[PDB]
Design a protein around this ligand. Structure first.
Ligand code: GSP
Lengths: 293, 305
């Protein structure tokens, strides 16, 4: 109800791994759920709730369909549900749309997070990665798509893989912190629900800066992020969060908010807020989520 | 800032990883892979992956390396997803069983495909464990050698020529855990907690890339002439199998407290140079470890025979 109930579901090996990284990094205010979808292997998790329903998406779908009642029990009462298969493919890409449709049929605000692999990784048959996206799209309120190729314009191979993991985690945290963790400017969850319900595909931009003019700088970087693929101009829904320390000033906060308004489409809904994270020092971190056209 | 991951595969490797964690090895991520779910519940590793669940039903590979290989191969995408982002990957196991023997080369190949500096650290079984385990270890080692930049092989038989003569079997395997820790830590601490002489990731990569098959020696000592003593012990270690003189590549680590001075470091280094092959490439590095007290610990990795 008033403290929103947010459930983050990692499904398949990539999804469970994503959730374990969220746990290791101290992501707060959410319940973690790890769903293993493979018969032959189990990735363990320190998630609160675990379900072992076990490289084919079709296998993952059936496994989740078969466990639909149990998954529904786990999700019941959630105001918001994140679903991700994380990096890599496999059975998780088949199971994710099932978890999403259960969440949504229950009335929860349902947010998918999906990555497009780097082009250098090649491609498995049937266009199955794109098929995974479309299935998840049909099944979510908002699907946040992270095109990993765009990271190479923001690099060694190890750096590329690490960037991919970082932005994936932020695909959840940027939004959840805005809701769960107080800052000077707080948001109404109903407006989040208002802007994200039925919104469809979304893209994300991030930006970071320190010291002098940091909030404007980080915001300008986020808004121009290659991960947004220049979707900012035409976006009809924009969520923006600025994370920083307690000393984050209202004037500098408002400058960033003004910038995003000036860059967004005239008719865009804009949800804006701040997050206090005193671990950041004199750094601020902006997350922008753009949806619609 | 190098990302280092240490994989323990099979019961022996997972037990060694547990030992590494218990002894406070820092700056590395610990990954445990096994075909036994209950055994993995006891692991303190950061990442725990249970493999070959259909084929083994959580009971191990029954000493059949083919089962271990297929279990790891079946989980190769998952394993790759766990390793992605690593600059360096260690793969440790006791060779001779099914899971480690069969699975370790799969993990190493994935690491090497990703371009991570890939170092295997494995034991040969004790002769008393039987000829099938020795033969299986021998095949597992050749296989793992194809997949690693450097493969450090520790003959468990030589461990019985070290430490105490009244050891039990459990104490013997515990010494195996320790030596595996020593081989990993001897290398990783250069990078993660350097002393006065800094050997960084690029230096380690320079000497360990494609170095091939390797042997290790360890020594420690306290008090007067500790550094000379520790170095002579390591140089003469049974684990080095009297092959120090033939090695074209040597990486040496000397660990001590913050007050370990250059004179001492250099005495040990001089001793090792003198004992080395004339054309040897030797890299000398130091480690800060403020828990060591008055002791210093010298590790030698010999390759290129
Ligand atoms: N370092 C260490 N080595 C061990 C330990 N127990 C056994 N070993 C060594 O490792 C070898 C392989 O044993 P183990 O690792 O337990 O098999 P496995 O790889 O898990 O293979 P399995 O599934 O067929 S049971 C043994 O032959 C022995 O030499 C241990 O606790 N610590």
């Amino acid at each position: 109800n008033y403290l929103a109930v947010i459930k983050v579901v990692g499904i398949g090996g990539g999804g469970v791994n994503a959730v374990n990284r969220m746990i290791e990094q101290g992501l707060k205010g959410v319940e973690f759920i790890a769903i293993n979808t493979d018969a032959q292997a189990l990735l363990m998790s320190d998630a609160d709730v675990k379900l072992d329903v076990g490289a084919d998406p079709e296998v993952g779908r059936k496994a989740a369909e078969d466990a639909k009642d149990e998954i529904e029990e786990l999700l019941r009462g959630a105001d918001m549900v994140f679903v991700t298969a994380g990096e890599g493919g496999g059975t998780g890409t088949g199971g994710a749309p099932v978890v999403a449709s259960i969440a949504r049929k229950l009335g929860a605000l349902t947010v998918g997070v999906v990555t497009r692999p780097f082009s250098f990784e090649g491609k498995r048959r049937s266009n199955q990665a794109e098929n995974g996206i479309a299935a998840l799209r049909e099944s979510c309120d908002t699907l946040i798509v992270i095109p990993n190729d765009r990271l190479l314009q923001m690099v060694s191979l190890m750096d590329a893989f690490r960037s991919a993991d970082e932005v994936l985690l932020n695909g959840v945290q940027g939004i959840t912190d805005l809701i769960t963790t107080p800052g000077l400017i707080n948001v109404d969850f109903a407006d989040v629900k208002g802007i994200m319900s039925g919104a469809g595909t979304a893209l994300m931009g991030i930006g970071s800066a320190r010291g002098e003019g940091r909030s404007l700088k980080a915001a300008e970087i986020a808004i121009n992020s290659p991960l947004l693929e220049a979707s900012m101009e035409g976006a009809q829904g924009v969520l923006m969060s600025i994370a920083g320390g307690s000393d984050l000033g209202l004037f500098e906060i408002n400058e960033a908010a003004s910038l995003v308004q000036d860059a967004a489409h005239p008719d865009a809904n804009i949800i804006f807020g701040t997050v206090i994270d005193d671990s950041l020092g004199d750094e601020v971190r902006v997350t922008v989520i753009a949806a619609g056209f």
